[PDB]
């Protein structure tokens, strides 16, 4: 397309996306197609000569829109939100249409310097001290790998410029809560740790790891000749949004020379709320922390924030130059990819356009709406909440009288799959304590108290065999 062909196409697409965001609630939250629907519906080869853009858009309405689960939906409650404020979407347009790449400062100064400013902007909004400095990764997954590669490198004296992992005399252990996200385990394994070497630490009544078990596990490996390396604590676990206690775990990791990396992907955003930073107490004792501004806060995916107190050790590892001294910026050296796009446009536009006053009320909205639905669920007979509601996620279940064990597990994913298939809401079944339950994660951008009331009505009715279509 010419730049003005593109501008005739630009305005048509701006309109299509504006009507989507407007009328999204009118659709089934989750896709109602079958595996193979699109591949069967598409050509088998690329076209030799270009095809008109109206042809695409037709295909976009007629083939692509029915095979979407809608994350930006008032009735989406699944997983954790993947929140896409239209101001940040407007930042992403500009980053793509500009076309620049950061391979170095010189290859575009405005990209790196903006990212430096906006990350410091948010560092302050989260309540973090001045010793913290951040970079945008693509995902928490990558971020925790960065942090476990950082952990490895600290405990092995930068072996990567020598024999690397296989020349180390002692197994490097990684200690995580038994409710830590599956990305934490993978990251260990991609950094070479071995499943054997990852000890899951048991949890408490509130599914938070017991520091007493950590220090038990840690003494036992020293009494085995293994070499403890790193702890990974989770502030807001995926199942129940449990809250690892980071001050006792941070004093342990400090007393034993281990890396404390904190996985605050989901609940990190709440730390712009001053009333919620009890959840983060101890975090100043941590070596790294990751928050997914592309989750709840509302910047469009991808935008994963990683903060270290020792950026000189990050640069040493990722630039594979351990002789480096900070006192004697190049985001190249702050993560895996040597090239980045202008994702700082997204943070900049959202932080500005909305304002910290809007971002605070929204998150406090999802917190307040999750206390409301927990109060109905507690009091309705036959219904129960299985975990504390310290964030905006509820672990709920319905209990027919007499119905225990496997049968109930079937009853629970049955109605969970029936509610999802109706189109009224999107919920994520998940296991807790060897039993199946159902998660309600409240925080999609347009989810307000009216929508949550409805969800509580569809939940009751789906058990009585009543399902709602649009
Ligand atoms: C979502 C999440 C992850 C995964 O982060 P990605 O950005 O999807 O890679 C890891 N840990 C926690 C606690 C999360 O909520």
Q: Is 330 among the annotated ligand-binding positions?
A: no
401 token code pair = 């009288």
Sheet of strand 304-308: strand arrangement: 133-137, 304-308, 288-292, 259-263, 227-234, 172-177, 198-201
CA torsion 455-456-459-463 (nearest 10°) is -150
From residue 174, alpha-carbon distances to 147, 166, 183, 286, 304 in Å are 12, 16, 13, 15, 22
CA of residue 328 relative to chain centroid, distance:
36
- Going from the Cα of 225 to the center of ligand 1, the distance in angstroms, rounded, reads 33
CA of residue 176 relative to chain centroid, distance:
17
Elucidation technique:
X-ray
Neighbours of 73 (CB within 10 A): 24
Q: Which among 344, 308, 329, 325 has a CA at the least distance from the CA of 146?
A: 308
Q: Is the CB of 183 under 6 A from ligand 1?
A: yes
The CA R_g of the chain, rounded to the nearest whole Å, is 24
92 token code pair = 């992403």
Contact, 12 vs 57, CB < 8 A?
A: yes
- Going from the Cα of 184 to the center of ligand 1, the distance in angstroms, rounded, reads 9
Which residues sit opposite 231 in a β-bridge? Answer: 175, 260
* Domains defined for the chain, CATH in brackets: 3-92 (1.20.1340.10), 93-354 (3.40.640.10), 356-464 (3.90.1150.10)
Residue with tokens 């009288």: 401
Q: Which among 443, 369, 358, 448 has a CA at the least distance from the CA of 125?
A: 358
Contact, 347 vs 95, CB < 8 A?
A: no
State how far the Cα of 441 lies from the Cα of 429, in Å rounded to an integer: 11
Contact, 301 vs 307, CB < 8 A?
A: no
Instruction: Give the strand pairing for 435-441 and 393-398.
Output: antiparallel
Q: For 121-150, give one letter per residue: b (16+ CB within 10 A) or e.
A: ebbebbebeeebbbbbbbbbbbbbbbbbbb
Cβ-in-10-Å burial (0-12, 13-18, 19+) of 307 comes to buried
447 token code pair = 């989810």
Which residues sit opposite 230 in a β-bridge? Answer: 174, 259
Q: Is the CB of 234 under 6 A from ligand 1?
A: yes
State how far the Cα of 164 lies from the Cα of 322, in Å rounded to an integer: 13
In the 3-class helix/strand/coil scheme, how is the chain assigned residue by residue?
CCCCHHHHHHHHHHHHHHHHHHHHHHCCCCCCCCCCHHHHHCCCCCCCCCCCHHHHHHHHHHHHHHHCCCCCCCCECCCCCCCCCHHHHHHHHHHHHHCCCECCCCCCHHHHHHHHHHHHHHHHHCCCCCCCEEEEECCHHHHHHHHHHHHHHHHCCCHHHCCCHHHCCCCEEEEEECCCCHHHHHHHHHCCCCHHHEEEECECCCCCECHHHHHHHHHHHHCCCCEEEEEEEEECCCCCCCECCHHHHHHHHHHCCCEEEEECCCHHHHHHCHHHCCCCCCHHHCCEEEEEHHHHHCCCCCCEEEEECCHHHHHHHHCCCCCCCCCCCCHHHHCCCCCECCCHHHHHHHHHHHCHHHHHHHHHHHHHHHHHHHHHHHHCCCEEECCCCCCCEEEEEECCCCCCHHHHHHHHHHHHHHHHHHCCCECEEEEECCEEEEEEECCCCCCCHHHHHHHHHHHHHHHCCCCCCC
At residue 86's C-alpha, the angle toward residues 83 and 91, to 5°, is 100
Within 13 Å, how many C-alpha atoms sit on residue 110's CB side?
A: 8
Q: Is 294 among the annotated ligand-binding positions?
A: yes
Contact, 266 vs 80, CB < 8 A?
A: yes
Q: Which atom, in ligand 1's list, is nearest to the CA of 79?
A: 1
Q: Which residues fall within 8 angstroms of residue 107, CB to CB, at 6 or more apart?
A: 100, 101
Q: Is the CB of 141 under 6 A from ligand 1?
A: yes
Q: Is 141 among the annotated ligand-binding positions?
A: yes
In the 3-class helix/strand/coil scheme, how is 397-440 assigned residue by residue?
EECCCCCCHHHHHHHHHHHHHHHHHHCCCECEEEEECCEEEEEE
Contact, 32 vs 66, CB < 8 A?
A: yes
Contact, 272 vs 356, CB < 8 A?
A: yes
State how far the Cα of 265 lies from the Cα of 232, in Å rounded to an integer: 12
Q: Which residues fall within 8 angstroms of residue 419, CB to CB, at 6 or more apart?
A: 425, 427, 458, 459, 462, 467
Q: Which among 289, 267, 264 has a CA at the least distance from the CA of 276?
A: 267
- Going from the Cα of 115 to the center of ligand 1, the distance in angstroms, rounded, reads 21
Within 13 Å, how many C-alpha atoms sit on residue 273's CB side?
A: 21
- Going from the Cα of 448 to the center of ligand 1, the distance in angstroms, rounded, reads 24
Q: Is the dihedral of CA 11, 12, 13, 15 positive or negative?
A: positive
Residue with tokens 């107190």: 309
Contact, 359 vs 298, CB < 8 A?
A: yes
- Going from the Cα of 288 to the center of ligand 1, the distance in angstroms, rounded, reads 15
Within 13 Å, how many C-alpha atoms sit on residue 391's CB side?
A: 31
Resolution in A: 2.0
Q: Is 83 among the annotated ligand-binding positions?
A: no
**Prior bond of 302 cis (ω within 30°):** yes
73 token code pair = 């939906």
């Amino acid at each position: 397309a010419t730049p003005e062909q593109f501008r005739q196409y630009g305005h048509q697409l701006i309109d299509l996306i504006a009507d989507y965001r407007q009328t999204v609630g009118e659709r089934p939250v989750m896709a109602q197609v079958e595996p193979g629907y699109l591949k069967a519906a598409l050509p088998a080869t690329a076209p030799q000569q270009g095809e008109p853009f109206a042809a695409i858009l037709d295909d976009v309405n007629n083939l692509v829109m029915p095979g979407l689960s809608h994350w930006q939906h008032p009735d989406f409650y699944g997983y954790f939100p993947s929140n896409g404020t239209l101001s940040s979407v407007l930042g992403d347009f500009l980053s793509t249409g500009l076309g620049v790449l950061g391979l170095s400062w010189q290859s575009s100064p405005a990209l790196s310097e903006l990212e430096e400013t906006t990350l410091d902007w948010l560092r302050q909004l989260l309540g973090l001290s001045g010793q913290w400095s951040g970079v945008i990764q693509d995902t928490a997954s990558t971020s925790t790998l960065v942090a476990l590669i950082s952990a490895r490198e600290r405990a092995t004296d930068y072996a990567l410029v020598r024999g690397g992992l296989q020349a180390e005399p002692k197994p490097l252990i990684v200690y995580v809560s038994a409710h830590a996200h599956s990305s934490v385990d993978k990251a260990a394994l991609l950094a070479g740790f071995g499943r054997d070497n990852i000890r899951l630490i048991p949890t408490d009544e509130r599914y938070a790891l017991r520091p007493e078990a950590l220090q038990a596990a840690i003494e036992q490996d020293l009494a085995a000749g293994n070499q403890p390396c790193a702890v990974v604590a989770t502030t807001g676990t995926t199942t129940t949004t449990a809250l690892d206690p980071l001050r006792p775990v941070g004093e342990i990791a400090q007393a034993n020379g281990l890396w404390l990396h904190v996985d605050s992907a989901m609940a990190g955003s709440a730390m712009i709320l001053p009333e919620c930073r009890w959840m983060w107490d101890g975090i100043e004792l941590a070596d790294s922390v990751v928050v997914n501004a592309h989750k709840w806060l509302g910047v469009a995916f991808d935008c994963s924030i990683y903060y270290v107190r020792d950026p000189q050790h990050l640069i040493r590892v990722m630039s594979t130059n351990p002789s480096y001294l900070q006192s004697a910026k190049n985001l190249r050296d702050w993560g895996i990819p040597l090239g980045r796009r202008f994702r700082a446009l997204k943070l900049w536009f959202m932080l500005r356009s909305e304002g910290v006053d809007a971002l605070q009320a929204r998150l406090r909205r999802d917190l307040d709406n999750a206390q409301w639905l927990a109060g109905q669920v507690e009091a309705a007979a036959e219904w129960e909440v299985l975990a504390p509601v310290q964030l905006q996620t509820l672990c709920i279940r319905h209990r027919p009288a007499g119905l225990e064990g496997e049968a109930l597990d079937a009853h629970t994913k049955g109605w969970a799959e029936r509610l999802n298939a109706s189109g009224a809401a999107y919920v994520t079944p998940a296991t807790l304590d060897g039993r199946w339950m159902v998660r309600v994660s409240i925080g999609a951008l347009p989810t307000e108290r009216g929508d949550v009331q409805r969800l509580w009505a569809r939940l009751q009715d789906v058990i009585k065999g009543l399902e709602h279509h649009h």
